[PDB]
Every structure is written in structure tokens, then in C-alpha cells.
Ligand binder design. Structure first.
Ligand SMILES: [Br-]
Ligand SMILES: [Br-]
Ligand SMILES: [Br-]
Ligand SMILES: [Br-]
Lengths: 206, 209
């Protein structure tokens, strides 16, 4: 309806996520089911593949398994992830990587995706991915995964938070295209710029 | 505190940028556009494409372009112009489609606007509609958001597009000035209209396809 302004049927379901996500930022300081796992130690086992070694660059990819351990030493959950180094930004040649992760808790599942700036994370910045719950008590939830690689061991130990909270009637997304759209919508708030304007009005490979 | 929505270490577990509420404000507005309002339906978009390859003959990552467009209404009046640029960046893991990122600057007699967003190169081929969010940048359009929708014409898919432009004022405006906020806004609205940047492959391995 309206060739002029055709938005997909799922648009209201995506839009509903945005006030919930901002409300989570204010409620995540202290009704709904709220899962907060603060100050986790994330033990990562990383398997990196090089396209054209010994240089990190486009075509590199990795898989990883994470165990999430709370300060009391208890495993609260696991994660399986995969990332691909995709391109260098036209503006400053930063390596842009995309990740997809599957989280497993004792009583359910959730997933993330998002962009990482290669330069930023080597400097010790926080990385943040939006979470959509996919099963168990998490299925009706949205949230945020925040990790910082420890300066001691930046590829094996991370400091990590996981925050998820129920939204009324749930996010209602099951189709992988809607889920991906939801993860991009929320990722806009927390993710790096994919390709800033260069100034010369040209997106040249650097 | 200056960069974040709620300052202090108690908010390290859920840190959003300070501009998050302005970004959120755009979503209801964007959804409302369907139903000061500038509309241009059934424009003929005359496109002068300048297309480069990196490993001809094959279409792949490193291919890029610049294009100049003229927007001509049905009566034959030039109502504005556009300068665009695009890059083929990678092949999706799932189905190997060529993912491209574009950035465009729109010039009208009475102001300016900008777009950015993803294109599935392997879907423009099928003559599907392409949609980019618009943010006003100056003059009449400075306070507006909108949508650019174009389809290459069958008889001339390299040089003539059928094009719609909708821009509408938000009261007090969108209140984005800095490239970081502009890019995030284009990315937030782009989630509704752009292609999936890398669908889950099923085998849990974003391996190069
Ligand atoms: Br390490
Ligand atoms: Br540019
Ligand atoms: Br405190
Ligand atoms: Br995957």
C-alpha cells in the first residue's frame, strides 16, 4: 500500500522494540522478568582463520565458544559465536567485522548480531550487541550484551554484562529476516558507523 | 557522562549514547509518513553512472561507482539533482549476494538532504524497488525525514529510474547535526527498508561464501 512509502508489515513490531530498549537503559540500574548478569568473566576459546596471512584483513573469519562465569565462580551460561572481517571503511580504513552469537542458559536461549570496528576493540573499547531472546524464559526478552577484552588476555578473557528483560506479549519475532531487522534496528543505538561520508563524495576502497 | 544516556558505573551494564532519545523520536515519524510535506511521485530519474571494477570481468568486492541523477517530474520540470556513491563490500555468507553501501546528497532549489543504506547487488538485478531513508540537511528540508524509493526502468536500467521522494517536517526538527548521530539515524531507519547484511547460515559459521 502506497508505492511512495512501502514499509514491511512487521514495521510496527520493530518500532515497539525501541521504547522498550530505551526504558531498559533506565530500568537497568535497579513486575517484568528481568535477567541481569553483571561483572561476568567470559572465557573465550577463539579459532581465527586468515585469508592472506600474516596480515589481518578482509576475508578473515573466526568461531568461538565462551563460558560466562559470575564472580562467585558459577557458570551461568555459554555462547557460540562467528565473525567475519568484511571490508575497510572508505573514511579511515578501519577493519569492519560482523558477528552473530547464540547464547545458551540452563533454562533457555537468546541471540545477538552486530558490527565491530577492528581499530576500536584493539584499543580496549566496550563492544555492545543487542540481544533478542529465542527460547525459555528469555523468549519474550530483548537486551544488551556488553564485553571488554581484558588488557592481560584480550582474546581469551573478557569482562561481560548480559541484561535481558521481558516486554509485554514478547517481541513476537520468529522469521529470521524480521529478527535480523530487529537486531539492525537496536544495533543502530550501540554499533559503529559502517561507512561515514569521506568528504570528497566518493566511497573509494582505501 | 557527556556521551552517555545515564552516567555512572551502575549503567556500565547498559550504556546507550546521549542522543538515543532523538533517534527513538524518528521511528514513529518515519512510520507515520505512509499516510510542511514535500512529495514527488513518478519522477523520471536521469542517472549518469561512472562504474569501476577491481577484478573484471567478474562482479565482486572492490567494485564501486559515482552517479549524478536529475529528478524530472512528469511535466518535464527538473525538480532537483543527486550525487551518489556506492561500494561492493562483501559476499553474504548465506547465499553469496553482493552487499553494497551507498551515500547520496540531494540538492533542490530550496535546500538539501542526504541518504545512506545497504543494497543487495543480486536483488537490484531482479528490478526490485530500492529504498533509502532521507534526512534533511539544509534550507526547507533541514527539519525533515523521508524515504527515497527507486526502480531501474526495464527499457533503461543503467540510465533511467522511476523514483519517488517523500520528505516531511518534524516540529523542532530531527535535531541531528554531527556525522555520528546522522549515520546512526540513517542506520536506525534503514533497518525497516534495507536488506539483511548477513543472515544466519544455519551451520553457525559466517564462513566467506
Ligand atoms: Br589472549
Ligand atoms: Br562519501
Ligand atoms: Br555508583
Ligand atoms: Br552464522
Amino acid at each position: 500500500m502506497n508505492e511512495r512509502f512501502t514499509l514491511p508489515a512487521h514495521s510496527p513490531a520493530l518500532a515497539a522494540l525501541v521504547p522498550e530498549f530505551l526504558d531498559l537503559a533506565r530500568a537497568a540500574s535497579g513486575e517484568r522478568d528481568l535477567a541481569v548478569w553483571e561483572n561476568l568473566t567470559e572465557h573465550v576459546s577463539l579459532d581465527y582463520r586468515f585469508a592472506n596471512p600474516p596480515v589481518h584483513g578482509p576475508g578473515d573469519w573466526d568461531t568461538y565458544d565462551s563460558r560466562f562465569v559470575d564472580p562467585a565462580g558459577v557458570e551461568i551460561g555459554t555462547l557460540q559465536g562467528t565473525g567475519r572481517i568484511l571490508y575497510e571503511r572508505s573514511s579511515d580504513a578501519h577493519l569492519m567485522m560482523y558477528y552473530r552469537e547464540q547464547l545458551t542458559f540452563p533454562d533457555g536461549t537468546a541471540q545477538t548480531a552486530g558490527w565491530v570496528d577492528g581499530t576500536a576493540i584493539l584499543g580496549g573499547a566496550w563492544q555492545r550487541f543487542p540481544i533478542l531472546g529465542s527460547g525459555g524464559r528469555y523468549g519474550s526478552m530483548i537486551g544488551l550484551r556488553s564485553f571488554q577484552p581484558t588488557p592481560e588476555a584480550p582474546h581469551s578473557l573478557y569482562r561481560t554484562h548480559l541484561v535481558l528483560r521481558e516486554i509485554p506479549g514478547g517481541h513476537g519475532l520468529t522469521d529470521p529476516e524480521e529478527i535480523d531487522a530487529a537486531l539492525s534496528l537496536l544495533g543502530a543505538f550501540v554499533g559503529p558507523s559502517v561507512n561515514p561520508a569521506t568528504g570528497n563524495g566518493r566511497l573509494e576502497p582505501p
